[PDB]
Amino acid sequence: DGAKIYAQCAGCHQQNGQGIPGAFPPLAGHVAEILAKEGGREYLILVLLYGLQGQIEVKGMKYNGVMSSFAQLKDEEIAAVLNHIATAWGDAKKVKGFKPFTAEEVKKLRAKKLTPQQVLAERKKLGLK
Numbered sequence: 001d002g003a004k005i006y007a008q009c010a011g012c013h014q015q016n017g018q019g020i021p022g023a024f025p026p027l028a029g030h031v032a033e034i035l036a037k038e039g040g041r042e043y044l045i046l047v048l049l050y051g052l053q054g055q056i057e058v059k060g061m062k063y064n065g066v067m068s069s070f071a072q073l074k075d076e077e078i079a080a081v082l083n084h085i086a087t088a089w090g091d092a093k094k095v096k097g098f099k100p101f102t103a104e105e106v107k108k109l110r111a112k113k114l115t116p117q118q119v120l121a122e123r124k125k126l127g128l129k
C-alpha cells in the first residue's frame with residue numbers, strides 16, 4: 001500500500017511528512033497547497049516520475065536541493081504513495097472534492113518524459129515561488 005511505498009520517501013521527507021528545514025521540504029500541510037493550484041496534481045506526479053531541482057520556497061523557507069526520479073515505481077505505486085502523502089496528514093481535507101490519485105493519471109504523464117529542470121518550470125507555472 002501507499003504507506004509501505006512511502007518508506008522509500010521517509011528518509012528525507014520523514015515519517016511524519018514534516019520534512020527537514022532547509023534540506024527536505026515538508027509534505028504534511030504543503031501537499032494541500034500544491035493541490036490547490038490548477039495543475040497541482042499533475043505536478044506531484046511529475047515530481048515522482050522525473051525528479052526535481054532548483055531553488056523553491058515552502059512555507060516561507062528556501063530549499064535548494066535535488067530529488068531523484070522514482071520512475072521505477074509502477075503507475076499504481078506512484079498513485080498509491082501520492083494518495084498517502086495527500087491523506088496521511090490531512091492535506092486532502094483542506095481540498096474540496098479530492099479525487100484519489102489513479103494509475104491512468106500517472107500513465108498519461110509517463111508518455112511525455114521531462115527533465116528535473118522542466119519539472120521546476122512546471123512548478124513555477126502553478127504560481128509557486
Ligand code: HEC
Nearest residue numbers: 008009012023024025047052053054063064065066067081
Ligand atoms: C531525499 C534523498 C529524498 C527522497 C528519498 C525523496 N525526496 Fe522528495 N524531495 C527531495 C528534495 C530535496 C526536494 C526539493 C528539491 C529542490 O528543488 O529543492 C523534494 C521535493 C519533493 C516534492 C515537491 C515539493 C514542492 O514544493 O515542490 C514532492 C511532492 C516530493 N518531494 C515527494 C516525495 C515522495 C512522495 C518521495 C518518495 C516516493 C520522495 N519525495 C523521495 C528529496 C527527497
